Structures are given as structure tokens and as C-alpha cells.
Design an enzyme around this catalytic site. Structure first.
Site, PDB file in Angstrom:
ATOM      1  N   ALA A  93       1.958  44.297  11.538  1.00 38.27           N
ATOM      2  CA  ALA A  93       1.493  44.385  13.018  1.00 38.27           C
ATOM      3  C   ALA A  93       1.428  43.564  13.675  1.00 38.27           C
ATOM      4  O   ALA A  93       0.692  43.766  15.041  1.00 38.27           O
ATOM      5  CB  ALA A  93       0.600  44.898  12.389  1.00 38.27           C
ATOM      6  N   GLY A  94       2.591  42.721  13.526  1.00 40.26           N
ATOM      7  CA  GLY A  94       3.339  41.901  15.633  1.00 40.26           C
ATOM      8  C   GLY A  94       3.604  42.867  15.910  1.00 40.26           C
ATOM      9  O   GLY A  94       4.116  43.915  15.838  1.00 40.26           O
ATOM     10  N   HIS A 144      22.334  35.525  11.461  1.00 41.98           N
ATOM     11  CA  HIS A 144      21.891  35.000  12.547  1.00 41.98           C
ATOM     12  C   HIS A 144      22.250  33.706  12.806  1.00 41.98           C
ATOM     13  O   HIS A 144      23.153  32.502  11.916  1.00 41.98           O
ATOM     14  CB  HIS A 144      20.769  35.010  12.597  1.00 41.98           C
ATOM     15  CG  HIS A 144      20.167  36.085  12.303  1.00 41.98           C
ATOM     16  ND1 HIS A 144      19.703  37.365  13.338  1.00 41.98           N
ATOM     17  CD2 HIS A 144      18.688  36.141  11.434  1.00 41.98           C
ATOM     18  CE1 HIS A 144      18.560  37.694  12.680  1.00 41.98           C
ATOM     19  NE2 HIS A 144      18.427  37.398  11.292  1.00 41.98           N
TER      20      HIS A 144
HETATM   21  N1  LIG Z   1      16.024  40.349  11.177  1.00 39.97           N
HETATM   22  C1  LIG Z   1      16.343  40.424  13.205  1.00 39.97           C
HETATM   23  O1  LIG Z   1      16.719  40.490  13.532  1.00 39.97           O
HETATM   24  C2  LIG Z   1      14.745  39.672  13.415  1.00 39.97           C
HETATM   25  C3  LIG Z   1      14.562  39.749  15.220  1.00 39.97           C
HETATM   26  C4  LIG Z   1      13.417  38.893  15.604  1.00 39.97           C
HETATM   27  C5  LIG Z   1      12.557  38.816  14.644  1.00 39.97           C
HETATM   28  N2  LIG Z   1      12.957  38.762  13.343  1.00 39.97           N
HETATM   29  C6  LIG Z   1      11.547  38.397  12.417  1.00 39.97           C
HETATM   30  O2  LIG Z   1      10.862  39.378  12.012  1.00 39.97           O
HETATM   31  C7  LIG Z   1       9.736  38.908  11.485  1.00 39.97           C
HETATM   32  C8  LIG Z   1       7.865  38.607  12.388  1.00 39.97           C
HETATM   33  O3  LIG Z   1       8.309  38.055  14.323  1.00 39.97           O
HETATM   34  P1  LIG Z   1       7.094  38.963  15.140  1.00 39.97           P
HETATM   35  O4  LIG Z   1       7.459  38.327  16.704  1.00 39.97           O
HETATM   36  O5  LIG Z   1       7.392  41.017  15.111  1.00 39.97           O
HETATM   37  O6  LIG Z   1       6.013  38.154  14.647  1.00 39.97           O
HETATM   38  P2  LIG Z   1       4.498  37.950  14.569  1.00 39.97           P
HETATM   39  O7  LIG Z   1       4.040  37.034  14.247  1.00 39.97           O
HETATM   40  O8  LIG Z   1       4.043  39.017  15.802  1.00 39.97           O
HETATM   41  O9  LIG Z   1       4.003  38.909  13.691  1.00 39.97           O
HETATM   42  C9  LIG Z   1       3.951  38.924  11.890  1.00 39.97           C
HETATM   43  C10 LIG Z   1       2.618  39.745  11.532  1.00 39.97           C
HETATM   44  O10 LIG Z   1       2.682  39.805  10.033  1.00 39.97           O
HETATM   45  C11 LIG Z   1       1.308  39.848   9.600  1.00 39.97           C
HETATM   46  N3  LIG Z   1       1.281  39.409   8.478  1.00 39.97           N
HETATM   47  C12 LIG Z   1       1.693  37.784   8.037  1.00 39.97           C
HETATM   48  N4  LIG Z   1       1.355  37.463   6.557  1.00 39.97           N
HETATM   49  C13 LIG Z   1       1.180  39.038   6.064  1.00 39.97           C
HETATM   50  C14 LIG Z   1       0.932  39.573   4.912  1.00 39.97           C
HETATM   51  N5  LIG Z   1       1.367  38.790   3.559  1.00 39.97           N
HETATM   52  N6  LIG Z   1       0.688  41.341   4.731  1.00 39.97           N
HETATM   53  C15 LIG Z   1       0.976  41.951   5.956  1.00 39.97           C
HETATM   54  N7  LIG Z   1       0.754  41.350   7.111  1.00 39.97           N
HETATM   55  C16 LIG Z   1       1.161  39.916   7.087  1.00 39.97           C
HETATM   56  C17 LIG Z   1       0.009  39.034  10.640  1.00 39.97           C
HETATM   57  O11 LIG Z   1      -0.470  38.574  10.911  1.00 39.97           O
HETATM   58  C18 LIG Z   1       1.529  39.354  11.766  1.00 39.97           C
HETATM   59  O12 LIG Z   1       0.643  40.386  12.891  1.00 39.97           O
HETATM   60  C19 LIG Z   1       9.169  36.827  11.532  1.00 39.97           C
HETATM   61  O13 LIG Z   1       9.975  36.392  10.089  1.00 39.97           O
HETATM   62  C20 LIG Z   1      10.689  37.029  12.521  1.00 39.97           C
HETATM   63  O14 LIG Z   1      11.817  35.256  12.134  1.00 39.97           O
HETATM   64  C21 LIG Z   1      13.814  39.412  12.880  1.00 39.97           C
HETATM   65 NA    NA Z   2      20.360  29.007  11.310  1.00 45.43          NA
END
Ligand SMILES: NC(=O)c1ccc[n+]([C@@H]2O[C@H](COP(=O)([O-])OP(=O)(O)OC[C@H]3O[C@@H](n4cnc5c(N)ncnc54)[C@H](O)[C@@H]3O)[C@@H](O)[C@H]2O)c1
Ligand code: NA
Ligand SMILES: NC(=O)c1ccc[n+]([C@@H]2O[C@H](COP(=O)([O-])OP(=O)(O)OC[C@H]3O[C@@H](n4cnc5c(N)ncnc54)[C@H](O)[C@@H]3O)[C@@H](O)[C@H]2O)c1
Ligand SMILES: NC(=O)c1ccc[n+]([C@@H]2O[C@H](COP(=O)([O-])OP(=O)(O)OC[C@H]3O[C@@H](n4cnc5c(N)ncnc54)[C@H](O)[C@@H]3O)[C@@H](O)[C@H]2O)c1
Ligand SMILES: NC(=O)c1ccc[n+]([C@@H]2O[C@H](COP(=O)([O-])OP(=O)(O)OC[C@H]3O[C@@H](n4cnc5c(N)ncnc54)[C@H](O)[C@@H]3O)[C@@H](O)[C@H]2O)c1
Ligand SMILES: [Cl-]
Ligand SMILES: [Cl-]
Ligand SMILES: [Cl-]
Ligand SMILES: [Cl-]
Ligand code: NA
Ligand code: NA
Ligand code: NA
Ligand code: NA
Ligand code: NA
Ligand code: NA
Ligand code: NA
Ligand code: NA
Lengths: 295, 295, 300, 300
Positions: B10-11, B164
């Protein structure tokens, strides 16, 4: 040309407000902030979501007030009394001059007091300087009613007055489900609990998030007010407006029912409040007055 | 009963994904996180925006995986290789068993590798375990094209492959504006600059925000994929899918054009890539393969 | 609020009001010469607003004065030389009365013969050519895109296509300029199958006519018209095929022909010139000849 | 995907398909006894999908087999005793053929006489009463809300209202149960002005008929019908006035009457019992008598 909306303060509420507005394709949006990079990044990020969603909205970020010139609506979500008073004064003094025909929608807390300050600094007609508070509060109340009654949120209406928390003036009598009094669906004691949960609604989210306050609903409420102005929808909603005798109150911004349109507050509605409700309102007005004097 | 979508993490990206999905009234949403209060607060906040927006969506937050049972779609946005590998394994191992008929949509980075891990841990049919990456990248590219050409984002289409940044395989030849090649609107050198800006798109937002990465567009891309599954829209989009010979690649998750529907990857399209494009793809596949081996 | 006047409250005009009302794009005035017809359809649609949630003033009238100061004027009042003269007189009457009242409006013609009637509207209104356009290509491309999506088994949201000319035999199909998420349509559909789709597109309007027995299509035609209205009102800069005045593009001069354009608040903001191959130019030239013939019959 | 079958591809049925298609709620099957009519309207609307962006399969047919396994069946095939018998035979034919093919569907009747035809549909289908309802109150309330919004000078999005009974003289208006953002309508509109609005509401359907000269309303009626379909398909739990089977509510038994209900995936999930005052009950009783009379004519 397209409508123009400037959001001052690119934090949680401001950025989320841009999101709700962008999805509605209501007009170009300018996100301004004192912090460099932040508004630019959030604006570009949202702009890059446009081909996916299908809306043609120019979302830009900036640190320069000149980019907000000639806006139709100015949303102020830059707040963190003294602290917010200085921030609000700084935002309005720089923004108001560049958009003389804009409707200003305050969100910064203490809401009623900050909206009053924005009216003073801007010198704009009172009808064009309003604050968002009641739409959010009524939304929480309506959510709780829908949840409890087991009905669609699309069928619950509610009006309330005053300010936040203890300053909030609940009016269950003035809430209905498809025209039917809520009292037909929910008993007195449960309704009283819903009213209390509404008063504490903001804090409830704060206690859960731990690091900040609510933004999805606050932004939605703000965006709906922006929409009302841009499309002259004449929405009937509780808004912080300048009173000149209504409910016996003068020289003060207070949450009251209004018809909101392109001209801002196009009418302040006068509800036939009973003595119990007026007692709540008077106590609220006194508290809002206290905050105003301190300001 | 209504469709059910579970968002693990839920980030920024997860909560924003809930926002895009809630507005579409696509189904009930469950926001899960390991941090207490956070998912509950964001879910309730969004739920309270429903009477304002008019959608009937049950948005709930939780820390208990049991609440995600029988989901139609599972979105994984819990990532922060080793670190994310453990997080991803922990999320899939607990979620997959409770929703055996769900389509899993990975977002955690390194995307291609994490999606592969999710397929392994879940044991789900390969077609039902996909990753989001290309829709976001193509969206940035389409945004830049629309901006440059001065046309509506609704009229720009684009396909790309790989992963990416350096692993991204741009395909300008496979992008058009209302069916017309983009080369008709934008010259080679400018197009090359747009391709490079697309490769660096994620970092561009990172460098601006300073404290985190993009979320409005990433969430929109993810939500569009969720919509494609729930409504069986059969969208043609670049998605991280398991390859069994396409483009000469085996046993690997790679960004490729697919028809996305209720059954997940319903078809992997085979583009007639020239030697220049295949050279880019081969280099990408090698880099994605390297990350996979490390995993 | 923005103001849109729809001249001719028949099937297309009323359906166009429906599409536009749902988008809450502006006040809508439906005008017709028949009493009651526009007032009834407008009120009916207005009464649907509380259900749908849009705040749009939808009114019917028989007085052109009510269309004054419109941002966009849609003409759907139309009913061989017989066809041309009849519609020429109706179009003439509609434009000569509406244009003077809305000098800054963009006129979007729908009446057939489309290209010719749009030419007449520019002639009668005296408006800059960029602000007098015709709807035809968006509908034709819509049918083509629908057939492609059906056949390829993909979302209609991922299919785009460009075409030129006019209706039926005057249509200039351009499969080379159609794609699914940026991928050539020819990669999804075989040559013979695609040729059939092109033929079905040419005869698309007739196909509906034959099924309904009475009257012609209106859902798609109105949607196409409404999308062009939205393009102007929201200044979206849509890239679409519309009937526009040519002064050299594709070798054509002094004629309204369906061509790729960028449509915005200023009407036609740019007429794109796609390099067409020998085969494609053969189709366009034969099409231009037919459109020219119709135009000459009109000028006579 | 969800599946909706619309029996009767006339004005209301086709317009209902339009509202539903735009909401992308599910596949839509338009059926009619007339050949070509449903196929043409369905194809026309389907061809508008690439323009609007919705992926909905819209097909026309003359075969009831194509409506099999529908989630919702909308009946808009209807055309004094003469009116009743004619529609009774059509309704009978439609239900006896469609119901058996979609045993788990919710039937939403539109054909007039509404309350009576809905009763006949329950009788012919054998379906649980909760899954056989009629649309009438949503439309009537929509007109009332439209007039109130117009007069009070407020958004249609902030006006809600409840009413019961049937059409025209059978309508049971309830101004006491109408509000603008939770505030009684009586606070915005004077008694005499409000009485006129109630009267205009009673005669709302006729007002459209008189203006169109030929045929009756369809935009609002279809919107009302479509909103009820959405209520079931999305299990929204809408609080609205619908024709439902009563077993004691308001003192009425064995009859279909417009009453406040919670509409969801299970059809009527609850019939609300509002405490009506003496004056209001006077209206309801006189209305029930008229509805009962119509019902008796039907049973005879
Ligand atoms: N594929 C794409 O195009 C793309 C684009 C942007 C970001 N991302 C990736 O998406 C992910 C999330 O980015 P974000 O900005 O929302 O991050 P964030 O840090 O805001 O949110 C991640 C959330 O995951 C929760 N979390 C951690 N471990 C957990 C577990 N075991 N179980 C349940 N919840 C857990 C945290 O407590 C946190 O609230 C990252 O890995 C980032 O690199 C991918
Ligand atoms: Na890379
Ligand atoms: N009225 C309501 O119903 C309601 C609901 C929630 C929050 N609020 C209030 O709204 C405000 C914003 O809340 P938030 O969560 O978005 O906060 P936040 O801290 O996330 O964002 C505020 C943003 O304002 C910017 N800022 C500060 N001073 C500025 C100046 N002089 N000019 C331009 N930008 C400036 C910051 O740099 C920051 O990005 C607070 O005052 C909060 O209490 C009101
Ligand atoms: N792709 C296209 O460009 C396209 C597609 C479909 C139909 N059309 C054409 O659009 C026109 C309308 O089609 P329709 O099916 O809606 O027809 P229709 O007969 O239903 O409606 C035309 C309406 O125009 C009104 N009318 C006649 N003369 C008028 C005048 N002088 N002023 C104002 N109103 C007047 C009529 O009374 C009638 O209500 C036809 O010419 C038809 O061939 C074009
Ligand atoms: N508020 C309401 O409940 C409300 C509002 C408006 C109209 N109505 C009623 O709805 C009905 C339809 O109105 P309309 O204007 O759409 O009518 P219409 O005449 O345009 O359409 C009815 C369609 O039903 C078809 N039909 C006839 N018998 C059939 C059968 N046995 N099976 C399948 N199809 C058959 C016809 O061929 C025709 O296309 C009427 O009874 C009308 O009075 C009710
Ligand atoms: Cl205050
Ligand atoms: Cl990887
Ligand atoms: Cl060009
Ligand atoms: Cl009750
Ligand atoms: Na605008
Ligand atoms: Na306080
Ligand atoms: Na007590
Ligand atoms: Na659902
Ligand atoms: Na956020
Ligand atoms: Na958001
Ligand atoms: Na160079
Ligand atoms: Na119609």
C-alpha cells in the site's frame, strides 16, 4: 482556450487534487510549490498517465508564480495559525494579482480563518473566495450512512455546517437517502455514533497513517468544488463563506449551505434550524470567532 | 458478486492504483501491507471519497492475507534483487494459495525477474502471471510524441519491448498517430531524443521528486492492465510475459506485445523485427537473462 | 457554458444531442422546422439528466434566434441531382439563417452529399474555410476499425485508421495507414480478408439502410459528429479524416474532400499531406473525379 | 462478461442499449420480431464503439435462443382493455420464450400498463417475485427532479425524490420525500409552484407524446431502465421507486405497485415501508384502486 486551474502547494492534497481534476479533463493544471523539483515531477508523472487514461490535460509543475497568471480557479493547499497564516498570506499575495478574475478555493487549516485571510489579502469579491471543509465532512458522514444502511453512496445526501471537529455542526435532520430521512434507516443512537465519527473523521485517518493526514477524500471534495465553478453546475454544498447576517453571524467565514457556480457563492441558503441546532451553531461560531481573533 | 482486486503493498504505486481502479468502479479493492495502519487509513480515505465521485466500491485496508482470498486479480506493488526477491517470494507464497483463479500482475522491480519469481512461487499457469512495465514506458513515449507533434494523446499508439532503461527495446517504426507513422510528424533526430527520454523516463521523475519514484503513470498503467483482465477487453499492449520461443527466447519473462484479457496473456504477438531491432532485443534479452541468473 | 446548436432534430441530430449531453460539453439547442419535434426530444433528453448526472441545458426550438452565439453548429437537416438540389435548398436555408447569428462558430456539416454540402455551407456562410468542415471520415473509419477489431479479436480502443475521400465509391481506403497499438493491420488480417473489410466499409452505410428498411444509421454517425464537436470545444487537437477545403493538397484545388487533419478550437488547424503510392493515388484521383462531378452538378 | 437481453428493439429498447453500451456493463442482445430492425440498430451502435472507446458486443436477433443465460432481461416490446389485451399478448409471448432460457435473470418490465404487465411477467415466468420488477418510478422521479432542479436553480445531481404507484392518475407524488442536498424541496419552492410541478410530473409522459405527435418518450425512459440494469449488474443497492410485488406493505396484497426499494444483484432486496400521513395515504389508496382495477381487467 481551455480553462486554467492553479494548485498552490504540491503536497498530498494538492497533487491528489490535480489527479481528480486531470481525470475530469476540466482544464490545464499548474502545480506550484516552493520546493524545487517536487511539483515538476508530480505534474510530469500525472501528464504521462494521460495517454493511458485518454484525457488531454496540460499538467505542469513550477516554482514561479508567473505561470499561474490568468487562472480561472486557484486552489490553495500549501498549509503545514501563525505558520499557516504566513504561508497563506504569501501564496495569496503573489497569486491573486496575477488572476484577478479567479475564484479562490482555500484548503489550508485552520480553514475558516485561512479563507478569511485569503479574502483580506486578495481583496477579491467575497463570493469568489471560499473554503473547502464541509464537502469533505459531509462526504465522510454520507459514507458512514451508506455503509450502515447498506445502500449506494449515490443515494445519500447530507448538509452540515461550521468548521472541523468540535466546530462542526452536524445536521442529521438534513440528510436523506433518495429523499427519505436517514432516521427511517438508522436509529438515534447509531446515528449519534456516526455523527461523532464524522467529527473525528480527520483524526481517524491521521491516527492510521501516523505520518500525515487524509488526502484522497479532501482532494475529491476540493476537485468537486473546482468542477462546480468551471462548469457552473450550481451545486448545493456546505462551504466556508463570508456571512453578512445569515444565522445571525457577521464578519466571519463559516461553513454554510450555498449554491456554488461560476460566480463562486451564488447564494447562501438559510436553513430553518431549531433551537438545539442553533445552540450547536452558536458554540461553533464562538470557537471560529476565537480562532479569527487570534488571527 | 462484484469482482475483487487485491493490491499487495500500500505504498505510492499501490495506493494510487487503488485510486485509478476505484474511480472505474471495477470491483472491491483490498489494500494489504505489512505496516499497520497505513493500508487501513489509505483505504478508508479513498472509500470516503466515494459519495463525492459516485462510485460504489468497497475499499478496505488490511495486514491479514486472509482478506485477499478469492481475488480475481492480485497486484503486487510491495517492492522496495535480494531484497525484492524475498519480499516478492513472501507476498506470492501467501497470496497465490488464497486466490487460485487470480491473474497476478507484478510491478516490483527488477520487473522481468520478479515476475518470473512470482510464476515460480505461485505455480500458476504462465499466462496468468504477468508484469507491468511496457504500458508505462509506452505511455511516456506516447506522451512525448503527443507533446512534440501537438496532437491528442488519444490518437497516439506505440509498441515497445524488453525491460526498463537500457533493457528497453524502443520501436518507433511501430508507433503511429491515427494510423499514420510517427515519422510523418517527427524527424529522426528528434525521435531519437524522445526514445532516449523514454529510456530515462523513470529516472527523470526520480531526479525531480528526490525522495521517491513515479506513481501516477505507473499506477495508471497497472490499473489499465487490471481493467483488461476484469472486462476481458483483449488489449494489445507490451507486457512482461513468459516466452517459449518467441523472438528466439526461451525460459524467460520479457516485455512483448500481447493480447491481454480475462485469461491473462491470451496471445503473444510476433512482430517482424528487422536486424537492427533484433540486435537491440538480443542485447536486452542478455541483460534480462543476467538479472535472471543472479536471481 | 459552451453552446452547441444542432440544426435538424431527426435521428442523427437527436442522437448527437444524446452523445453530447452525456459528455456535459455545453448547452445544447436542437432546432427543426417541424413544430414540437425538437421541443419534445430536447425535453425528453433533459429529463434524463438527473439519472445520468449531467448538468446540460437541452432545449428544442423552431426559432433560429435561439442558436445565436453558438460555439459549434451541427447541421443534420438533410433528407442523382434530385438528392443534391433538395439538400442544397435545405442546407442553403439552414446556413443562411444560422451562420450570421454565430459568426465565430465552427460549422460541422453532416447532410449528404457530404463533401458538396460542406462546400455549399462555406459558400453560403462566408466563414473562413478552416471553420466549415464535414463529418464523414470519422464514421467510415469507425466502421472499418470496428470490423478490424472484431476480426483481429482485439479491443476497439487499440485500433486506429485513416482514410479519405467521401462515401461509398468516393471513399479512399488506406489499409497501409491503419494499426493496432502501432502494429500494421496487415500483420493481423490476410489480404483477401482485409479486402472484404474494405468493401464492407465502402458499403457500410448501405448495410444499415438495408437492415432498418426505413431510414439510415444514426448511432455511429452521431458519435462521429459528437467526437468532432468535442475536438473543437476542448481544443483536443484530434488527428482525424474530415471534409476540408483543399488548395493543393493531394493535387486537389477548390473542393471539399475527406483528408487527414488536426482538429482543434480553430477548426481545421492543419491539413496533413500523406505521401500516397501509385495505387493509392489511383483511388484518390478516381474519387476526386466523382466528388468534383457532384460539386459541378451543385454549381450548375 | 455480463449479458443483457433487450426484448423489443423500438425507441426505448434501442435507446436503452445506447445508455448501457456507453457504460460498458456487458454484452447486449437486442431482440425483435421484425427482421432487420434489431440487427441494424445493434450494428449501428456497435460501430460507434471505436469512437466512444467501449468494448461491448452489441448484436441484433429475431431468435430467442440468443438471449440464453442473460443476467438481466429488459422488456420493451409493448405497443381501455384494448391496450391491456394487446400488450398482455405481447408480454405473454416475450416472457414465456425468454424466461425459460435465462432462469437466473432479473426481469425488468417497461411495457405499459407497467404495473399490470410486470404482474403478468411474474405470473408467466414463475420467477421469484424479487427478480421480476418494473420501471416507472425512476422515470417519473427523474422528471420531477428535473423540474425541481430547473425551478430551484440547482444541479440535477443534488436533487433526489421518492414517489409511488403508477403512471399519471395512478402516480402517488410525495413532495415531503424529496430534497436538495438533504434539504426539503418545500424550502426552495412555494406550495402553488410545487403543486404545478407535481401536476406536470403526473402528465409528464403525455407532455412528450403531444410534442412528438408520433410516438412517446425514450431518452429518459431508457436512462431510467438502464440505471436499474446497472443497479443489478453492479449490485449497487440503489434506493429507488420500482414496481414490486406487495404482500402487505402499505396495506396492499397480491399486486405490483411502485414502492421504494433497495435494488441489487438479487433484484428487490428490500421493500421500504415509509410511514405516510393521512393525506398521502388517501392518494395511495385511490391509486391502488386504479391499479387493482387494471389488474382485474387483466385477470379477466
Ligand atoms: N514496473 C514499473 O513500471 C514500476 C514503476 C514504478 C515503480 N515500480 C516498482 O514498484 C514497487 C513499489 O514502488 P512504490 O513507490 O509504491 O513504493 P513504496 O515504498 O511507496 O511502497 C511499497 C509498500 O510495500 C509495503 N511492503 C513491503 N514489504 C511488504 C510485504 N512483504 N508485504 C506486503 N507489503 C509490503 C511497504 O510497507 C510499502 O507500503 C518498487 O519495487 C518500485 O521499484 C515499478
Ligand atoms: Na538497469
Ligand atoms: N479543509 C479540509 O477539509 C482539509 C483536509 C485535509 C488537509 N487540509 C489541510 O491542507 C493543507 C495541505 O495538506 P497536505 O497533506 O497536502 O500537506 P503537505 O505538507 O503534503 O503539502 C503542502 C505543500 O505546500 C508546499 N508549500 C509550503 N509553503 C508554501 C508556499 N509559501 N508556497 C507554495 N507551496 C508551499 C510544501 O512545500 C508542500 O509540498 C494543510 O494545511 C492541511 O491541514 C484541509
Ligand atoms: N456520415 C455522414 O456524413 C452521414 C451519416 C448518416 C446520415 N447522414 C445524412 O444526415 C442527414 C440527416 O439524417 P437523418 O437520418 O437524421 O434524417 P431525418 O430525416 O431523421 O432528420 C432530418 C431532420 O431535419 C429536419 N429538417 C428539414 N429541413 C429543415 C430545415 N430547413 N431546417 C431545420 N431542420 C430541417 C426535419 O424536419 C428532420 O427532423 C441526411 O442528409 C443523411 O443522409 C450523413
Ligand atoms: N415509464 C415506463 O415504464 C415507460 C416509458 C415509456 C414507454 N413505455 C412503454 O414501453 C413500450 C415500448 O415503447 P417504444 O416507444 O419503444 O415502442 P416501439 O413501438 O418503438 O417499440 C416496440 C418494439 O417491440 C417490438 N415488438 C412487438 N412485439 C414483439 C414481440 N412479441 N417480441 C419482441 N419484440 C416485439 C416491435 O416490433 C417494436 O420494434 C410501450 O409499451 C410504451 O408504452 C413505458
Ligand atoms: Cl477556523
Ligand atoms: Cl529484470
Ligand atoms: Cl503531413
Ligand atoms: Cl423502511
Ligand atoms: Na477547458
Ligand atoms: Na479544533
Ligand atoms: Na445513552
Ligand atoms: Na464488479
Ligand atoms: Na499520493
Ligand atoms: Na492519487
Ligand atoms: Na548526430
Ligand atoms: Na433514436
Amino acid at each position: 482556450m481551455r480553462k486554467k486551474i492553479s494548485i498552490i502547494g504540491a503536497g498530498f492534497v494538492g497533487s491528489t487534487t490535480a489527479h481528480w481534476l486531470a481525470a475530469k479533463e476540466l482544464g490545464d493544471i499548474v502545480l506550484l510549490d516552493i520546493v524545487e523539483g517536487v511539483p515538476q515531477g508530480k505534474a510530469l508523472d500525472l501528464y504521462e498517465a494521460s495517454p493511458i487514461e485518454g484525457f488531454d490535460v496540460r499538467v505542469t509543475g513550477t516554482n514561479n508564480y508567473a505561470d499561474t497568471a490568468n487562472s480561472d480557479v486557484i486552489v490553495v493547499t500549501s498549509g503545514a495559525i501563525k505558520v499557516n497564516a504566513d504561508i497563506t498570506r504569501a501564496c495569496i499575495s503573489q497569486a491573486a494579482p496575477l488572476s484577478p478574475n479567479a475564484v479562490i478555493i482555500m484548503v489550508n487549516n485552520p480553514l475558516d480563518a485561512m479563507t478569511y485571510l485569503a479574502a483580506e489579502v486578495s481583496g477579491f469579491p467575497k463570493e469568489r473566495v471560499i473554503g473547502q471543509a464541509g464537502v469533505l465532512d459531509a462526504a465522510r458522514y454520507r459514507t458512514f450512512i451508506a455503509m450502515e444502511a447498506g445502500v449506494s453512496v449515490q443515494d445519500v445526501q447530507a448538509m452540515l455546517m461550521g468548521g472541523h471537529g468540535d466546530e462542526m455542526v452536524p445536521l442529521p435532520r438534513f440528510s436523506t437517502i433518495s429523499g427519505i430521512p436517514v432516521s427511517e434507516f438508522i436509529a438515534p443512537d447509531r446515528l449519534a455514533q456516526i455523527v461523532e465519527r464524522t467529527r473525528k473523521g480527520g483524526g481517524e485517518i491521521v491516527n492510521l497513517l501516523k505520518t500525515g493526514s487524509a488526502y484522497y477524500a479532501p482532494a475529491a471534495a476540493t476537485a468537486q468544488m473546482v468542477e462546480a465553478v468551471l462548469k457552473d453546475k450550481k451545486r448545493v454544498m456546505p462551504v466556508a463563506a463570508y456571512l453578512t447576517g445569515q444565522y445571525g453571524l457577521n464578519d466571519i467565514y463559516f461553513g454554510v449551505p450555498v449554491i456554488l457556480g461560476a460566480g463562486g457563492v451564488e447564494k447562501i441558503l438559510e436553513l430553518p434550524l431549531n433551537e438545539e441546532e442553533m445552540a450547536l451553531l452558536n458554540a461553533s461560531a464562538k470557537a471560529v470567532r476565537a480562532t479569527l481573533d487570534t488571527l
